[PDB]
């Protein structure tokens, strides 16, 4: 899974809960007011049967989303 | 007057959900004191949408919120997008200035 996740004026600080929504972390890219940015996270591999992330496989690096990853 | 987010393999086509608008700042700008540019939106069956006037920033930011909520229930009133857009803009003083032959991409 590759989730588009914040209306955010700053870079934040990656999720730590192995959730696939995560604490309090939107699952798909919202809308956005012209001061923020969109930040996405190249999240690990998911488990469907658990519906988080496996053990281990932390989420990725948080970048800016500039148009298409 | 082009589209910062616009998609690589062809021309005139945006990516992102929101479309980033900007345009060089006009010559002669300090012939004249105070300045401002007029942005009106058009749909592709030619209906306006929004004229917005922008005075001292030369990159203006749609938003999607904007183009559905502001705009595609005020113009059926029902939910949808907009997903063929036009632009056009001129470039007005104050005193009796306006530019001549609008401007688009």
New interface residues.
């Given amino acids: 899974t590759v989730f588009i996740y914040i209306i955010g004026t700053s870079l934040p600080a990656k999720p730590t809960s192995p959730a696939y929504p995560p604490s309090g972390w939107s699952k798909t890219?919202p809308?956005?007011?012209?001061n923020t940015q969109n930040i996405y996270c190249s999240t690990g591999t998911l488990d469907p049967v658990t519906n988080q992330l496996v053990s281990g496989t932390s989420w990725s690096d948080v970048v800016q989303?500039?148009?298409?990853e | 007057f082009r589209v910062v987010n616009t998609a690589s393999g062809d021309v005139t086509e945006f990516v992102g959900p929101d479309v980033k608008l900007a345009w060089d700042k006009i010559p002669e700008e300090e012939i004249i004191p105070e300045i401002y540019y007029t942005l009106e939106i058009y749909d592709s069956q030619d209906r306006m949408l929004r004229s917005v006037r922008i005075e001292d920033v030369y990159t203006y930011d749609y938003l999607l919120t904007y183009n559905k909520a502001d705009f595609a229930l005020l113009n059926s009133g029902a939910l949808g997008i907009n997903r063929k857009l036009r632009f056009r803009i001129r470039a007005e003083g104050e005193n009796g200035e306006q530019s001549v032959g609008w401007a688009t991409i």
């Fill in positions: 890219p809308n956005r007011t012209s989303w500039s148009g298409t």
